[PDB]
Design a protein around this ligand. Structure first.
Ligand SMILES: Nc1ncnc2c1ncn2[C@@H]1O[C@H](C[C@@H](N)CC[C@H](N)C(=O)O)[C@@H](O)[C@H]1O
Ligand SMILES: [Mg+2]
Ligand SMILES: [Mg+2]
Ligand SMILES: [Mg+2]
Ligand SMILES: [Mg+2]
Ligand SMILES: [Mg+2]
Ligand SMILES: [Mg+2]
Ligand SMILES: [Mg+2]
Ligand SMILES: [Mg+2]
Ligand SMILES: [Mg+2]
Ligand SMILES: [Mg+2]
Ligand SMILES: [Mg+2]
Ligand SMILES: [Mg+2]
Ligand SMILES: [Mg+2]
Ligand SMILES: [Mg+2]
Ligand SMILES: [Mg+2]
Ligand SMILES: [Mg+2]
Ligand SMILES: [Mg+2]
Lengths: 101, 88, 219, 73, 119
RNA sequence: GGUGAAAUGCGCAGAUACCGGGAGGAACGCCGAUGGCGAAGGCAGCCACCUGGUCCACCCGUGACGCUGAGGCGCGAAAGCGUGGGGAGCAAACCGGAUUAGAUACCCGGGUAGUCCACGCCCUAAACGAUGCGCGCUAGGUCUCUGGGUCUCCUGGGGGCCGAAGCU
């Protein structure tokens, strides 16, 4: 397996419930593909540099997983299927290349 | 790709003696391993010609080390082949 | 009968020909066609006429032969065929078939046949055409510098006055051509003609050209 | 001249690989979404080469712009 | 005849002509002018003077709808684009801001021969 | 709109300029270099998977296993060909406008093949460093990309410039 970094930007207009439901499918999806959730962050809402789906804001989810690379591509096909999901970027984790230090 | 595990497994499985890392037997083994993976990758990706040259070379360096084996020990040779399962 | 297919020569029967021309109201024959350009240009502008070009030298026709077999979108045509033959042995399959026929700027033996004229050969030329088919012949020495030639195959000098003479007219009559018209043309006019030699002659030095036209009467 | 201040010096020890630090990344962008040249980023061939990927990754996520309008003129 | 007051002014310069379009706080045009709208017909149409006249014509006409303040937006480069941005500032309208928003591809369509020979 | 000026052209069935929505194709601004990779042809949005080459340090393993390479096989820009798909922009041919003594051109308006994809074919080039591959030996200086080091410089691999001896 390889350690990755899932990014997900979904509609900033979801209510407490609607939101927690989309996260459901995500967590559900992850396991379905072997995603072993090492951790998570949730900056939530953020003012996008440019509008996405006409909406000028976005809700963020960040998951650092570990899973079978042979499926990482599917994992995202799946994650993009959602209608409230308006961005999905999976990235190979990488040592933090420092600078100006 | 081939994990360090996948690798050393072959290295120890062929080594002539404890700590043997560069015996012709080993090298040939490791090359047979790389070749197969590549030959595989290439059964699909029939367009990735660039990689194919890499294969032409692996196969090259191998058939050339083997050539060296006969010349020297004609026994270890027949031995290596049968084992690795080379020729065809 | 020999036709040209690309750079390759193949046989064509009368029955095949009849089936081809069945799709057309008119047939035009250009005899001693040379490079094929008269037939090609004429063909691109009249899809209601079937064009047959006859020349004894096949390599000359290659460029146009290769062109006509291309796809229509790249200039291919379906109303042109090239026949490989000489006036002295014209294919029987072409007898009594043409609604109109031209010989433009002949030279060598063909020129001798038109201008002396050789009665048997021109009769055989007339034989390709149906009763009253149109014909035109365009010739030009005008002489002098080109001779050489007058000293060689004998030949006419040859003025409009010569083409108007009772003797030439009578000989033509014996071969089946009724002269309807005779015109003297100038260099500027000949540029209309779209053909090897018409162009070469035209942009070259001043020359007298003569166009003789009319109908086939033998039948 | 381009001797106003190197974006690098005018800043702390950051992880050039981090594609979410809109805070710092935004620093290497022209008065437009354009990525500044080393002349102004004060970064090196290697550093500057890693920035680009990061600044581009950040653009897709919507955190950083691709291009901004110019004011004045 | 609506009475807007605050709006936008789009200056579309080009090496052949200048055309100014005034609009309301959100894009819909109120009035428009150009090198042709006024006298000039061919080459003259481009020239900075025309740009000037056209700018003015644009404001004057827009003064009718009760315009007063405008945000200028420059698109393209050409025969006197600055003159237009000036004729406005003077026209009477208080110019709130000038902004270059000339479009540029991130390399998409092969341009016509006339605009190639580059790279 | 377009040009030296123009015209063809488009527009009152409302064009151009402006705002919003959608569809589709092709390319990938800044970073970008005087840069990097590849055997060459050639290769630049970002992401993942599959995969080739290559450098450095340690000197640990094999122990001459090396070099070149007729023929072979493979790869081979563009255009071009075959079947099918796609087609936004561009544009041979072609259709027009203008210029001209003429204009089968250059300029302007259109525009088909093509340019894109797949599968197969073609195999060429100023396919250029106009410089075949490998190895050893013969002052330095300077800038640069990438690795190691006792890291104001030394050391290894690569890219440039200037130049010893020498060569021409
Ligand atoms: N005896 C002949 N019979 C038929 N054709 C002939 C004979 N002799 C010469 N020709 C052809 O006459 C043509 C004369 C050439 N100048 C081409 C003439 C052609 N019609 C043209 O106008 O371009 C040549 O192509 C010769 O091959
Ligand atoms: Mg009306
Ligand atoms: Mg729009
Ligand atoms: Mg379409
Ligand atoms: Mg190299
Ligand atoms: Mg090159
Ligand atoms: Mg040792
Ligand atoms: Mg030993
Ligand atoms: Mg060799
Ligand atoms: Mg091609
Ligand atoms: Mg094709
Ligand atoms: Mg097609
Ligand atoms: Mg054109
Ligand atoms: Mg192909
Ligand atoms: Mg090729
Ligand atoms: Mg170092
Ligand atoms: Mg060096
Ligand atoms: Mg010297």
């Amino acid at each position: 397996m390889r350690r990755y970094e899932v990014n997900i930007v979904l509609n900033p207009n979801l209510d407490q419930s609607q939101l927690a439901l989309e996260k459901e499918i995500i967590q559900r999806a992850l396991e379905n593909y072997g995603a072993r959730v090492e951790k998570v962050e949730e900056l939530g809402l953020r003012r996008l540099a440019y509008p996405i789906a006409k909406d000028p804001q976005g809700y963020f989810l960040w998951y650092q997983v570990e899973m079978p690379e042979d499926r990482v591509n599917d994992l995202a096909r799946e994650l993009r299927i959602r209608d409230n999901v308006r961005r999905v970027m999976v990235v190979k984790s990488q040592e933090p290349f420092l600078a100006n230090a | 790709p081939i994990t360090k595990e996948e690798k050393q497994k072959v290295i120890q499985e062929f080594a002539r003696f404890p700590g043997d890392t560069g015996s012709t037997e080993v090298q040939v083994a490791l090359l047979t391993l790389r070749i197969n993976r590549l030959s595989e990758h290439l059964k699909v990706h029939k367009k990735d010609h660039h990689s194919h040259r890499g294969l032409l070379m692996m196969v090259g360096q191998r058939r050339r080390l083997l050539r060296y084996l006969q010349r020297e020990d004609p026994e270890r040779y027949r031995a290596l082949i049968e084992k690795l399962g080379i020729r065809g | 009968m020999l036709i040209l297919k690309g750079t390759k020569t193949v046989d064509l029967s009368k029955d095949e020909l009849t089936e081809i021309i069945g799709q057309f109201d008119r047939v035009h024959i250009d005899l001693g066609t040379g490079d094929g350009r008269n037939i090609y240009k004429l063909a691109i502008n009249d899809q209601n006429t079937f064009y047959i070009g006859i020349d004894p030298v096949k390599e000359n026709l290659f460029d146009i032969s290769k062109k006509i077999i291309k796809k229509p979108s790249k200039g291919g045509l379906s109303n042109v065929v090239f026949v490989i033959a000489a006036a002295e042995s014209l294919p029987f399959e072409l007898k009594n078939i043409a609604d109109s026929i031209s010989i433009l700027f002949p030279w060598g033996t063909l020129l001798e046949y038109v201008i002396k004229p050789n009665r048997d050969i021109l009769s055989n030329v007339a034989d390709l055409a149906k009763k009253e088919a149109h014909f035109e012949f365009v010739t030009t020495y005008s002489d002098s510098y080109e001779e050489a030639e007058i000293k060689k195959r004998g030949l006419p000098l040859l003025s409009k006055a010569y083409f108007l003479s009772e003797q030439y007219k009578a000989e033509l009559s014996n071969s089946g051509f009724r002269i309807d018209d005779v015109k003297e043309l100038d260099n500027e006019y000949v540029k209309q003609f779209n053909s090897l030699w018409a162009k070469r002659l035209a942009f070259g030095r001043k020359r007298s050209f003569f166009r003789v036209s009319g109908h086939v009467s033998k039948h | 001249p381009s001797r106003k201040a190197k974006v690098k010096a005018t800043l702390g020890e950051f992880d050039l690989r981090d594609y979410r630090n809109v805070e710092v990344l935004k620093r290497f962008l022209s008065e437009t979404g354009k990525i500044l040249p080393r002349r102004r980023t004060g970064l090196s061939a290697k550093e500057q080469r890693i920035l680009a990927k990061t600044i581009k990754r950040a653009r897709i996520l919507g955190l950083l712009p691709f291009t901004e309008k110019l004011v004045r003129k | 005849k609506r009475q807007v007051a605050s709006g936008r002014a789009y200056i579309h310069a080009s090496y052949n002509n200048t055309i100014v379009t005034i609009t309301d706080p959100d894009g819909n045009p109120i009035t428009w002018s150009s090198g042709g709208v006024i006298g000039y017909k061919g080459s003259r149409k481009g020239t900075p003077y025309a740009a000037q006249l056209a700018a003015l014509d644009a404001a004057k006409k827009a003064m009718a709808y009760g315009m007063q303040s405008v945000d200028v937006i420059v698109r393209g480069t050409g025969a006197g684009r600055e003159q237009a941005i000036r004729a406005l500032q003077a026209s009477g309208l208080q110019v709130k801001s000038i902004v270059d928003d000339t479009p540029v591809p991130h390399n998409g369509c092969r341009p016509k021969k006339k605009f190639r020979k580059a790279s």
